[PDB]
Design a protein around this ligand. Structure first.
Ligand SMILES: O=C1NC(=O)c2c1c(-c1ccccc1)cc1[nH]c3ccc(O)cc3c21
Ligand SMILES: [Mg+2]
Ligand SMILES: [Mg+2]
Length: 259
């Protein structure tokens, strides 16, 4: 053996795990810097799963110049593994910040929600300008590094006009995508970003299915435990409109008067 991973990096700790492998905080020996490295089992060459694994790499290889998307450094294969070395964000995930806030009953305030929405919105405007869509926006895929929010986990990225898509987290999924209608994919990322902001505003954990799931898809915002300006609430509402054409594009969101 004597892995590139082992020889080039000192592994500090495990920071994420899934049915997609694990992510480790590592120090690169030569440059002294800390990176996040995802190490996953290598798919059978030529398989659909390998195509999917490589999309992640290809998406990272083209989305590496934006301040609101986690930067990519390198990727390689060794052993029975594929590895991707990305920028490390020392503030943890948005999900973890929201979970801590939940317990302490002190949520993101309106100014902070607007900042989150604008920052990730800029990240989305960049991804969408590249004719790509993220397809899995949610708090556990947004990382924190003035606070800076960055979109990570490009494992569901695909081209905007793709006839096949892999569905992102059910809790943030727009109905049209579930219905296999891929005519306005970028608006699916907008819908998930609004629900992401709702979670940051202190809402109860989102439904995975059932009656409350359908209600949100009818364009009804979940209850938020704080008073928000009507103008801001209306923007979140239009972002989950049942008609994807009514939702703002990422460009329109970033230029929105409310922000
Ligand atoms: O790319 C990343 N940059 C990161 O800083 C990072 C990343 C990932 C990640 C890496 C590849 C695929 C999907 C997620 C998971 C992650 N979980 C984390 C938990 C804590 C943290 O401070 C950072 C990360 C983290
Ligand atoms: Mg993830
Ligand atoms: Mg993929």
């Amino acid at each position: 053996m004597k892995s590139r991973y082992t020889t080039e990096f000192h592994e500090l700790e495990k920071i994420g795990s899934g049915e997609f492998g694990s992510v480790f905080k590592c120090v690169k020996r030569l440059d002294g810097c800390i990176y996040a490295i995802k190490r996953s089992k290598k798919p059978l060459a030529g398989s659909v799963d390998e195509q999917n694994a490589l999309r992640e790499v290809y998406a990272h290889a083209v989305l590496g110049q934006h301040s609101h998307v986690v930067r990519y450094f390198s990727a390689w294969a060794e052993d029975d593994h594929m590895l991707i070395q990305n920028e490390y964000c020392n503030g943890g995930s948005l999900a973890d910040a929201i979970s801590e806030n939940y317990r302490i009953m002190s949520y993101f305030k309106e100014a902070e929600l607007k900042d989150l929405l604008l920052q990730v919105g800029r990240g989305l405007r960049y991804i969408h300008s590249m004719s790509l869509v993220h397809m899995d926006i949610k708090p556990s895929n947004i990382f924190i590094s003035k606070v800076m929010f960055k979109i990570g986990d490009l494992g569901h990225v695909t081209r905007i006009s793709s006839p096949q898509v892999e569905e992102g987290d059910s809790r943030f999924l727009a109905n049209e995508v579930l219905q296999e209608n891929y005519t306005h994919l970028p608006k699916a990322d907008i819908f998930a970003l609004a629900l992401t902001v709702v979670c940051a505003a202190g809402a109860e954990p989102l439904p995975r299915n059932g009656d409350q799931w359908h209600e949100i898809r009818q364009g009804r915002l979940p209850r938020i435990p704080q008073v928000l300006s009507q103008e801001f609430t209306e923007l979140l509402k239009v972002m989950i409109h049942p008609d994807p054409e009514r939702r703002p594009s990422a460009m329109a969101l970033v230029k929105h008067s409310v922000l």
